[PDB]
Coordinates of C-alpha atoms and ligand atoms in Angstrom, one line a residue:
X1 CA 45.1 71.9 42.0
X2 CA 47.5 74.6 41.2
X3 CA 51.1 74.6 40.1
X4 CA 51.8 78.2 42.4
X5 CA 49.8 76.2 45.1
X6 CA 51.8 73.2 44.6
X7 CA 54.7 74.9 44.5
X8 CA 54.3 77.5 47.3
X9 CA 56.6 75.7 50.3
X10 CA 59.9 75.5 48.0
X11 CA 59.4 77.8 44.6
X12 CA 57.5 81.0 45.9
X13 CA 56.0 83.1 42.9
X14 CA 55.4 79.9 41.0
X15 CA 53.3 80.6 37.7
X16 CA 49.7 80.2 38.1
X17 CA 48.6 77.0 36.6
X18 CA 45.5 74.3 37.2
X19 CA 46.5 70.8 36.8
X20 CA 44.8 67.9 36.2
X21 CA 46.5 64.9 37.0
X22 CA 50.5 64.5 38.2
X23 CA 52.4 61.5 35.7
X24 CA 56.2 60.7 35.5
X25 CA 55.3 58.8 32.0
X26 CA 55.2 61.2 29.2
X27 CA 53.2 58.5 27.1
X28 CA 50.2 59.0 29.1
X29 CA 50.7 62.8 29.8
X30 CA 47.5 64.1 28.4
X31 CA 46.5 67.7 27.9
X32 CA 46.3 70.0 31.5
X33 CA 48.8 67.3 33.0
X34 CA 51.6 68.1 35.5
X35 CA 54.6 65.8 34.0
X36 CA 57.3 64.9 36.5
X37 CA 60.9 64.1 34.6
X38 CA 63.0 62.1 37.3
X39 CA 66.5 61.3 36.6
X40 CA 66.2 57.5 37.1
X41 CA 68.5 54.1 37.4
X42 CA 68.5 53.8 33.8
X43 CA 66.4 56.8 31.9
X44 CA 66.2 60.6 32.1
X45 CA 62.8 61.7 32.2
X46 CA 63.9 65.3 30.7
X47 CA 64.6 63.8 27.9
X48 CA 60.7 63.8 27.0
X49 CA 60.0 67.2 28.1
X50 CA 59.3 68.3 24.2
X51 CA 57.0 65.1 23.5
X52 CA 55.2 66.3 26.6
X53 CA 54.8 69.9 25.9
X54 CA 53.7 68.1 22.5
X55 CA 50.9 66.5 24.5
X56 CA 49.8 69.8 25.9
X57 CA 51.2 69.3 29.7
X58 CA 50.1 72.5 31.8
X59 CA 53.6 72.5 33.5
X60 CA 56.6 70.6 34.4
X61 CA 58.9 69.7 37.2
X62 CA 62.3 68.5 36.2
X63 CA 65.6 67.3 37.8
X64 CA 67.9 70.6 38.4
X65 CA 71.0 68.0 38.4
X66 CA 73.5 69.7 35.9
X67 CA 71.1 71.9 34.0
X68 CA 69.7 73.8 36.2
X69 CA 69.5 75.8 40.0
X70 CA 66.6 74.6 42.9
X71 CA 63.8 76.2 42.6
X72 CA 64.8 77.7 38.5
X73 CA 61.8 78.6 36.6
X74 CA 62.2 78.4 33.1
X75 CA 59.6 78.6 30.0
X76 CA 59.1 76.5 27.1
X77 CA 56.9 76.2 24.4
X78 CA 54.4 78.4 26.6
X79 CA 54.6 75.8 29.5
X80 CA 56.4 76.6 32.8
X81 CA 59.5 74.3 33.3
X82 CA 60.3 74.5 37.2
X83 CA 63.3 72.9 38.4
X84 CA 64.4 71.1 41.6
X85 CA 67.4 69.6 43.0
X86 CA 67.2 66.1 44.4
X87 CA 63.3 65.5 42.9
X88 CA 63.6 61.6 43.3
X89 CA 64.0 62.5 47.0
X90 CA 61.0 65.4 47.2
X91 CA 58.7 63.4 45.4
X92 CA 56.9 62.2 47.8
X93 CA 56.2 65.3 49.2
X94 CA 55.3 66.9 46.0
X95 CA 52.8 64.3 45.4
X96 CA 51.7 64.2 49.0
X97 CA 50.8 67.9 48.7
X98 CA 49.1 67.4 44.9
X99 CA 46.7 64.7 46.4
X100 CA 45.8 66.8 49.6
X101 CA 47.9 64.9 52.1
X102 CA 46.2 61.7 52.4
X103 CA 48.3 60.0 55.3
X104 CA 47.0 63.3 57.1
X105 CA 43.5 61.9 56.5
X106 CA 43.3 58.5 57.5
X107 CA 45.3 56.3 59.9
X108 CA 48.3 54.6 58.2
X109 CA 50.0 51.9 59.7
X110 CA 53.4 50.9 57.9
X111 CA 54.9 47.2 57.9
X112 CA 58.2 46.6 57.5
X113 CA 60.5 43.5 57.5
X114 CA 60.9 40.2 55.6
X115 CA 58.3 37.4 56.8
X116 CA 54.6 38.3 57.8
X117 CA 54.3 41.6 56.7
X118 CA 51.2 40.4 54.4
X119 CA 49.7 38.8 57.4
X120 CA 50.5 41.6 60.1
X121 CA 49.0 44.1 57.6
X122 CA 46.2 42.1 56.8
X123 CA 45.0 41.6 60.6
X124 CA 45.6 45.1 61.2
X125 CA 43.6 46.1 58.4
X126 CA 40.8 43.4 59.5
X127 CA 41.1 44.0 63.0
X128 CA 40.8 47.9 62.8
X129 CA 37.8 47.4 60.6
X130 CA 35.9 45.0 63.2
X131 CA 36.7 48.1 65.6
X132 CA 34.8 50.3 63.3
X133 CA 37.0 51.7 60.4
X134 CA 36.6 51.7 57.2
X135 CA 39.9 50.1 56.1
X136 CA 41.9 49.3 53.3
X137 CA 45.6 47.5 52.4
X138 CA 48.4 48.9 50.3
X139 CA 50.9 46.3 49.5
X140 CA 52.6 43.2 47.3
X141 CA 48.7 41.4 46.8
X142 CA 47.3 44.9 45.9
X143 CA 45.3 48.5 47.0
X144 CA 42.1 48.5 47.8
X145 CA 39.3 48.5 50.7
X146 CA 39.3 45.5 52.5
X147 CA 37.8 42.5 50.4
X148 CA 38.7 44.5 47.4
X149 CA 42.0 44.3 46.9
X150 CA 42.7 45.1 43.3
X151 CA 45.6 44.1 42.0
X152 CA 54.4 52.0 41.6
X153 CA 56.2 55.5 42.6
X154 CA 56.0 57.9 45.0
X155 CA 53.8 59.6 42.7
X156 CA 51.2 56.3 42.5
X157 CA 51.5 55.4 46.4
X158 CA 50.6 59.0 47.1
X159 CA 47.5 59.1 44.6
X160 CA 46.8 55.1 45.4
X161 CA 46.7 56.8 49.2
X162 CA 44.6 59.8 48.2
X163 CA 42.0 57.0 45.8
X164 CA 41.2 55.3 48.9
X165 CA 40.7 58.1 51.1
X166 CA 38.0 59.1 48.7
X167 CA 36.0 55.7 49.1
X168 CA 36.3 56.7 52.6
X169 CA 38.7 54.7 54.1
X170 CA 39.6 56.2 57.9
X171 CA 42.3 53.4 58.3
X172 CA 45.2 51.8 55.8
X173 CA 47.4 49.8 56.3
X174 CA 50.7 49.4 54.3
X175 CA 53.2 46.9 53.7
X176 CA 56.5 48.9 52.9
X177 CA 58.9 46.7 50.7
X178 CA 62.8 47.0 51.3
X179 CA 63.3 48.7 48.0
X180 CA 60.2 51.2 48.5
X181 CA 61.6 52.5 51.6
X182 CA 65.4 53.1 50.3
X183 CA 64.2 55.0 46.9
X184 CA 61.9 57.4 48.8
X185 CA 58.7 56.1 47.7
X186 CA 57.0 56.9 51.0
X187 CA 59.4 59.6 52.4
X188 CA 56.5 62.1 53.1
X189 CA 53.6 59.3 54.3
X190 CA 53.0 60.3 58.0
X191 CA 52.7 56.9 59.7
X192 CA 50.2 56.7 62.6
X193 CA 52.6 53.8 63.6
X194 CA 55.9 51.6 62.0
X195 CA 55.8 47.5 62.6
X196 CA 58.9 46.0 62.1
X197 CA 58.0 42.5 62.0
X198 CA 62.1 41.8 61.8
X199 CA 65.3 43.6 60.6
X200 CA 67.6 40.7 59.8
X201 CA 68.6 39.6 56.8
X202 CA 70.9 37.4 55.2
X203 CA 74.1 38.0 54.5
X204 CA 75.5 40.4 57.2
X205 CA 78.0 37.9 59.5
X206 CA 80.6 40.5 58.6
X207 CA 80.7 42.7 62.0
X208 CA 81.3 45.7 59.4
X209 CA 78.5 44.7 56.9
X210 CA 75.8 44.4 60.1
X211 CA 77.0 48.4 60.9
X212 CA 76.7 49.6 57.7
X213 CA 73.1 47.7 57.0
X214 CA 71.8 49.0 60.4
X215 CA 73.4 52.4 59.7
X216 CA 71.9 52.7 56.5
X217 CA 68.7 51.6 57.5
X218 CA 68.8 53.9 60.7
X219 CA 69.4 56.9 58.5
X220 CA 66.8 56.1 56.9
X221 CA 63.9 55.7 59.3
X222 CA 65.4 59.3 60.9
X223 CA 64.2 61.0 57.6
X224 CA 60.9 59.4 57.9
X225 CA 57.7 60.0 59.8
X226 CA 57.4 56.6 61.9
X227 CA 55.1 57.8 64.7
X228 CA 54.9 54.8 66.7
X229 CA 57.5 52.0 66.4
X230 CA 56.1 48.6 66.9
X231 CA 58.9 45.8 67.3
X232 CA 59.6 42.3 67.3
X233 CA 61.7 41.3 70.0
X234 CA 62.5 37.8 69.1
X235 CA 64.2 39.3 65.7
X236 CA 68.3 40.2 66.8
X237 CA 68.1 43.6 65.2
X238 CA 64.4 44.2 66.7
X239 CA 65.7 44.0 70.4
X240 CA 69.0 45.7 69.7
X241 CA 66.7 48.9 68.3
X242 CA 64.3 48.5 70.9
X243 CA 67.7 49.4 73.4
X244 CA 68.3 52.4 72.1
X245 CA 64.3 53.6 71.0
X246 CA 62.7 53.8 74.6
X247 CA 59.6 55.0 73.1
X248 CA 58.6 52.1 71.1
X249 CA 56.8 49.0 72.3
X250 CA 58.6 45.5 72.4
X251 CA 56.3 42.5 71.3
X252 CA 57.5 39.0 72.4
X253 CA 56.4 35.6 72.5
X254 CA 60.4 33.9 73.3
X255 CA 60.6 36.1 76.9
X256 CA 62.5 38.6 75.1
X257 CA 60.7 41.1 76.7
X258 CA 63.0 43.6 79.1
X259 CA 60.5 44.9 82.1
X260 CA 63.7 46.8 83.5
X261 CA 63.4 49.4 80.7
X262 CA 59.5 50.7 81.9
X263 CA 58.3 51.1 78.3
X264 CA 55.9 49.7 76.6
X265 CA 55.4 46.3 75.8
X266 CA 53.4 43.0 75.2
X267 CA 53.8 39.7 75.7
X268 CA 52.7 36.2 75.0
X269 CA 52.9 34.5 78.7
X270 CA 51.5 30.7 77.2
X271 CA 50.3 29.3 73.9
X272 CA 48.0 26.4 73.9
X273 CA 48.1 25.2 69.8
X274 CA 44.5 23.1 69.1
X275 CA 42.8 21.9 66.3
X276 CA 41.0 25.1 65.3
X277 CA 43.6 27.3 66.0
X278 CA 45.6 29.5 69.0
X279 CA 44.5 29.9 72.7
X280 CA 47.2 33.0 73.2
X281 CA 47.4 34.5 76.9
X282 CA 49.7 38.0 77.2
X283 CA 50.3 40.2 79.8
X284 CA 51.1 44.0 78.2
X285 CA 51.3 47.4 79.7
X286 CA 48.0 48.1 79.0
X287 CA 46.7 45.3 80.9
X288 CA 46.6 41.2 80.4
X289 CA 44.2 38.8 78.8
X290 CA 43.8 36.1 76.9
X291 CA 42.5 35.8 72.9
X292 CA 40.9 32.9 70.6
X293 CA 43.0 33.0 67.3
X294 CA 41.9 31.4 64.1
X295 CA 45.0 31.2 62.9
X296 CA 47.6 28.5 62.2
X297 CA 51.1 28.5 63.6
X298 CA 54.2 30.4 66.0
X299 CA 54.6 33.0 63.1
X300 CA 51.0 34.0 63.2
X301 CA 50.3 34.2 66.8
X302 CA 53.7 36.8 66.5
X303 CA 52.1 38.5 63.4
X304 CA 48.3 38.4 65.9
X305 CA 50.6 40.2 68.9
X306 CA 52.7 42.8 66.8
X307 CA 48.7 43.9 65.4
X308 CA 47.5 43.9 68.7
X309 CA 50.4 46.1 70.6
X310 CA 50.1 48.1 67.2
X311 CA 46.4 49.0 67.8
X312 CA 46.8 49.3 71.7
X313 CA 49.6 51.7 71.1
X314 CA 47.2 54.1 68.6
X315 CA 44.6 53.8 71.8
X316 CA 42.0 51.5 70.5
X317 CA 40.3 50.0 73.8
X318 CA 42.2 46.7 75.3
X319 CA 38.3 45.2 75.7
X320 CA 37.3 46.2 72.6
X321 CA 40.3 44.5 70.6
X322 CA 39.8 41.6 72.7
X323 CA 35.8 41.1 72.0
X324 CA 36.7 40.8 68.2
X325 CA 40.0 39.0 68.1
X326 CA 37.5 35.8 67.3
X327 CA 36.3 37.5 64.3
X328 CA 40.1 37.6 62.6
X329 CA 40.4 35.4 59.5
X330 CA 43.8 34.2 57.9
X331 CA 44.9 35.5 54.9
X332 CA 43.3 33.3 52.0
X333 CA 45.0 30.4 51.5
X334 CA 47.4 31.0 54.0
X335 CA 46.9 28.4 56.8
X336 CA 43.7 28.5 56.0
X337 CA 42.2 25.8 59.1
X338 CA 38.9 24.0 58.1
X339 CA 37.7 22.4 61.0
X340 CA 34.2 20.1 61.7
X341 CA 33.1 18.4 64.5
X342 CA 33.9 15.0 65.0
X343 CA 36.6 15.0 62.0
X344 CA 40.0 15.7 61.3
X345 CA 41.7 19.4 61.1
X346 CA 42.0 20.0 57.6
X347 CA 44.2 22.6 56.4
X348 CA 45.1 24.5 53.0
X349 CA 47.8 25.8 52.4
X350 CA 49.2 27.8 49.0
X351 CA 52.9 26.3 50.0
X352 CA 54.3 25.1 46.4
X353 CA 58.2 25.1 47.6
X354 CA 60.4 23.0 49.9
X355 CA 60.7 25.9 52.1
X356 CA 57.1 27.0 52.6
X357 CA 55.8 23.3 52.9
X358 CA 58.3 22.6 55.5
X359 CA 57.4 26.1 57.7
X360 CA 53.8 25.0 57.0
X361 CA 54.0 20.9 58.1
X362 CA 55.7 22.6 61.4
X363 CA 52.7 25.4 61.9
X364 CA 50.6 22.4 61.6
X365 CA 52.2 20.1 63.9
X366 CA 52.2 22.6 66.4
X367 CA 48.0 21.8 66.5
X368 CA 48.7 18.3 65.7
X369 CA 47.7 15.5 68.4
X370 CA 47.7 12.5 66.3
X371 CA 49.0 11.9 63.0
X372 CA 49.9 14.9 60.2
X373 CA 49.1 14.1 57.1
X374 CA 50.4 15.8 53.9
X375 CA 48.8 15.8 50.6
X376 CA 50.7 17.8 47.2
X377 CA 52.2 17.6 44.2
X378 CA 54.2 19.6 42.0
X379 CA 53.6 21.7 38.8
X380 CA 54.2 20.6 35.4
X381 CA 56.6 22.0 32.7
X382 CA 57.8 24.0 35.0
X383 CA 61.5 23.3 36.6
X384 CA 61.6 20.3 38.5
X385 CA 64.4 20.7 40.9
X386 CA 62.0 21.0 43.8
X387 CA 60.4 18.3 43.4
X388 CA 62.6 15.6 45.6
X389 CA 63.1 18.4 47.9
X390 CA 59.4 18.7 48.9
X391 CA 59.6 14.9 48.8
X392 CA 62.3 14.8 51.0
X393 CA 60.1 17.7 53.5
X394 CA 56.4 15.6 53.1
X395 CA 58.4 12.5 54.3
X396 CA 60.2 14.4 57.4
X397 CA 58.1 16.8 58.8
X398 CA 54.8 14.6 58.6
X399 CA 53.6 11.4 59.8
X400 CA 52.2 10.2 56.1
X401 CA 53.0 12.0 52.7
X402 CA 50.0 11.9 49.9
X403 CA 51.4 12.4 46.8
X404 CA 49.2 13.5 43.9
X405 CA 48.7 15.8 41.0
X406 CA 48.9 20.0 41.2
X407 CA 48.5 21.3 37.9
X408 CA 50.6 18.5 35.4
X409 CA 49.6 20.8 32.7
X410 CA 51.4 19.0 29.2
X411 CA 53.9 16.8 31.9
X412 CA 53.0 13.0 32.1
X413 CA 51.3 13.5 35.4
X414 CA 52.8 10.4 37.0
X415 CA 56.5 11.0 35.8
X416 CA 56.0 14.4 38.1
X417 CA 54.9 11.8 40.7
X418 CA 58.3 9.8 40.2
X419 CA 60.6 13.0 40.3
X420 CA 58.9 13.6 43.7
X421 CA 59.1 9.9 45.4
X422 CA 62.7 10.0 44.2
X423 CA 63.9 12.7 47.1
X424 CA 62.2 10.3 49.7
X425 CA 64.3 7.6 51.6
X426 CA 61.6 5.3 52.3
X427 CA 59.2 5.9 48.8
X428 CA 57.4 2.9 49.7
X429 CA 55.5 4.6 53.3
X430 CA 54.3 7.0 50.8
X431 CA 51.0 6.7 49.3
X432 CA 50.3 7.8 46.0
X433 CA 46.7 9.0 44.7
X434 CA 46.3 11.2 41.5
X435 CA 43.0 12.2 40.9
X436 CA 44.1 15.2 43.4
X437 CA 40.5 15.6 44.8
X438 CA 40.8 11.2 45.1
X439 CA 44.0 12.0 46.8
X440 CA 42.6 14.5 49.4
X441 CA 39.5 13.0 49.6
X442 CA 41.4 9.8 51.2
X443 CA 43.8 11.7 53.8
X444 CA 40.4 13.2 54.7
X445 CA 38.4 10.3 55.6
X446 CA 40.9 8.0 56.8
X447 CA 42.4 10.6 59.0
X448 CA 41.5 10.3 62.7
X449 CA 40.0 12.9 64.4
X450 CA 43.1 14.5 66.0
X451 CA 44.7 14.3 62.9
X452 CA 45.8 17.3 60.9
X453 CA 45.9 17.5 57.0
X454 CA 47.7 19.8 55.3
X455 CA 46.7 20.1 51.7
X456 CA 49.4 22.0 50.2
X457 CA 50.0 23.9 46.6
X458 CA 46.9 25.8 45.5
X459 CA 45.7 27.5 48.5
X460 CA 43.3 30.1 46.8
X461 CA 44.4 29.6 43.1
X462 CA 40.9 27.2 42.5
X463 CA 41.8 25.8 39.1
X464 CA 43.5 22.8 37.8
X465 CA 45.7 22.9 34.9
X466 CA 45.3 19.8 33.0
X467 CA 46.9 19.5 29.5
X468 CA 45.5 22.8 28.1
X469 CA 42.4 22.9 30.3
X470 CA 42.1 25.0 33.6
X471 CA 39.6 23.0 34.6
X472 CA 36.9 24.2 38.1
X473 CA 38.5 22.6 41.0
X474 CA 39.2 24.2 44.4
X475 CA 40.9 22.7 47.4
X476 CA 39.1 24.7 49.9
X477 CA 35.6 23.8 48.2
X478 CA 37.1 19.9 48.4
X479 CA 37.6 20.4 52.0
X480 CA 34.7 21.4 52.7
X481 CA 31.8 19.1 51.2
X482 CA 34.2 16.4 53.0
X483 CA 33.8 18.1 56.3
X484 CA 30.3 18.8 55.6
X485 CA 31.0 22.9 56.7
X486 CA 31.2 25.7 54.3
X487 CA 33.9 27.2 51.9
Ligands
O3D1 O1 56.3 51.9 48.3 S1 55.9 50.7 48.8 O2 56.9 50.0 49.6 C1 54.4 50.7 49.6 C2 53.3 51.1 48.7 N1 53.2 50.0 47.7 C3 51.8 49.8 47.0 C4 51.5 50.6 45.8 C5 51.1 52.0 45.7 C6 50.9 52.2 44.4 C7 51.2 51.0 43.7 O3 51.6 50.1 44.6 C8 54.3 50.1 46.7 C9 55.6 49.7 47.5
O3D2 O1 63.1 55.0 65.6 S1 63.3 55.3 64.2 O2 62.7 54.4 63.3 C1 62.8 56.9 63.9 C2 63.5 57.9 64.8 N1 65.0 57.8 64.5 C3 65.8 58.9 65.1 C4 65.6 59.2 66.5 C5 66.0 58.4 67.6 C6 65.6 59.2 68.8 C7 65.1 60.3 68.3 O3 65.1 60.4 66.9 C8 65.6 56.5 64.8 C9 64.9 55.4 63.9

């Protein structure tokens, strides 16, 4: 690594200069360093230039806004001080070409939009893998390969990117956040493909606001390096881009599929929701089948397709994908179905908000034959507005509503209880069990066998806060030694 090298496609006759590692925080700036000072929201990085010359930086590349030309090499202290115009927006690139131009070395898929972006860039990461990859996930849980995750500029997604491709990773896939995207954190990341798992949001019923987000957001994806769009069709925005993007592929399961057009595209023609999960037939351009998914719900057979069109579009083998579909596992704690035979669908579920345990007592209902039963409680000492709201859910959207204990930490564990039986209408069908294992033990073994349980709240988190104790106790390993199957 070499600060003339580095340099060579904007500043030509850069000084010659190894360089160690490439840092926007002069704190850690160490001796040999490359120090990056970016004119930010609230802080000037310039101003530590003398701290990091201090620190014995090799070089540094600073913001040319005001005191300075593009490309101006200066000298201080020894150390070269190279300026550039608009470096929050080049820093990608910079950092790109520092770590050897890791989206050049592996297959990155981005995913972008609001709901299932963990999901969709989980199955593609899993999926991919079970192909033969060696993959990893970038995103909100963490970096790593897959199974471990561990858990950020332009500068860190680019040497994040570079990390993984040095434990050999041949495949990553990314979820892009809103905010990553607009401040140019992965402006220079050449994307094998772009899912856009939706591009509504809220507040845009304003004809004028709708223009200026799409504009804005269009702009945007013009600068970047997309190679394949994947998109949602049942989203608004989704089918109005797929209109104008003939290139891209549209994934539907609402028959919002267009065959007029001649792209590319895949659909879901019927669903069949059972106990253990999703019997999905599609038809696509690339031929029609029909796949065994392990996973809970309408979003998730929508986040299963958009993975699927996104791997047939990069060329993996329509067989192939379909001989492992089987082997794709939902996201821990997410929907997570335990199943046994003979005995009622159990599923966990990390939902701890009336929002989430409403979307996930209709994912379960859609697998739900005979009776859906709920079991949750709330958190103590924590704010306990929610907690006649999820009442209020557990009594609507299932058939009975279990109501026990989910980390009362200090909190008089019944009072919680109270606060929650007080949103319902009729308190009285409710059954109360505390003693949270007690509780799901009973929704288990008086369920029938086309009965669905949700247990909701934990998910993965496989502790219970009691007074000051986080004491061993896991939902899924509950589940489990009731069903007689395997955590
Ligand atoms: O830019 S992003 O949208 C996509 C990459 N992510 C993961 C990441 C890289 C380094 C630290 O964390 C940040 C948000
Ligand atoms: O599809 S996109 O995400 C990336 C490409 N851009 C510009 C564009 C449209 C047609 C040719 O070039 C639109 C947004």
């Amino acid at each position: 690594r070499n600060l003339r090298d580095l340099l060579a496609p904007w500043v030509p006759d850069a000084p010659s200069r190894a360089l160690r590692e490439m840092t926007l925080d002069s704190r850690v700036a160490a001796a040999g360093d490359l120090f990056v000072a970016v004119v930010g929201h609230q802080a000037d990085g310039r101003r530590y230039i003398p701290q990091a010359i201090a620190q014995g930086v090799a070089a540094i590349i600073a913001e040319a806004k005001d005191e300075a030309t593009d490309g101006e090499i200066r000298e201080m202290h020894g150390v070269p001080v190279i300026y550039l115009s608009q470096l929050n927006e080049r820093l990608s690139a910079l950092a790109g070409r520092f770590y050897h131009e890791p989206s050049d070395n592996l297959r990155l898929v981005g995913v972008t939009g609001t709901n299932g972006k963990t999901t969709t860039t989980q199955l593609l990461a899993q999926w991919s893998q079970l192909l033969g990859e060696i993959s990893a996930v970038m995103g909100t849980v963490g970096n790593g390969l897959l199974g471990k995750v561990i858990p950020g500029s332009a500068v860190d997604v680019q040497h994040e990117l570079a990390g993984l491709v040095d434990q050999g990773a041949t495949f990553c896939a990314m979820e892009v956040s809103s905010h990553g995207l607009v401040q140019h954190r992965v402006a220079a990341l050449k994307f094998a493909a772009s899912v856009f798992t939706n591009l509504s949001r809220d507040h845009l019923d304003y004809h004028g606001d709708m223009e200026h987000y799409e504009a804005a957001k269009w702009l945007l994806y013009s600068e970047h390096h997309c190679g394949q769009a994947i998109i949602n069709a049942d989203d608004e925005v989704g089918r109005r881009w797929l209109a104008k993007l003939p290139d891209a592929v549209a994934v539907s399961m609402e028959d919002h599929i267009n065959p007029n057009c001649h792209g590319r595209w895949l659909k879901a023609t019927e669903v069949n929701y059972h106990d253990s999960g999703a019997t999905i037939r599609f038809s696509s351009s690339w031929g029609d089948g029909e796949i065994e998914s392990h996973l809970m719900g309408a979003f998730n057979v929508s986040n299963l397709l958009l993975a699927l069109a996104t791997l047939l579009a990069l060329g993996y083998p329509l067989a192939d994908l379909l001989k492992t579909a089987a082997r794709l596992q939902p996201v821990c704690g997410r929907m997570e179905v335990f199943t046994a035979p003979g005995k009622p669908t159990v599923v966990v579920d990390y939902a701890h908000t009336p929002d989430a345990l409403e979307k996930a007592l209709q994912a379960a209902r859609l697998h739900c034959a005979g009776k859906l039963w709920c079991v949750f409680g709330c958190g103590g000492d924590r704010d306990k507005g929610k907690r006649p709201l999820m009442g209020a859910i557990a009594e609507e959207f299932a058939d009975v509503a279990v109501v026990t204990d989910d980390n009362p930490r200090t909190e008089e564990p019944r009072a919680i209880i109270n606060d929650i039986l007080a949103g319902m209408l009729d308190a009285g069908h409710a059954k109360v069990m505390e003693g949270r294992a007690e509780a799901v033990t009973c929704a288990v073994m008086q369920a029938k066998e086309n009965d669905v349980v949700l247990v909701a709240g934990k998910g993965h988190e496989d502790y219970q806060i009691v007074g000051n104790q986080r004491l061993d106790y896991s939902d899924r390993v509950t589940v489990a030694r009731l069903l007689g199957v395997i955590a």
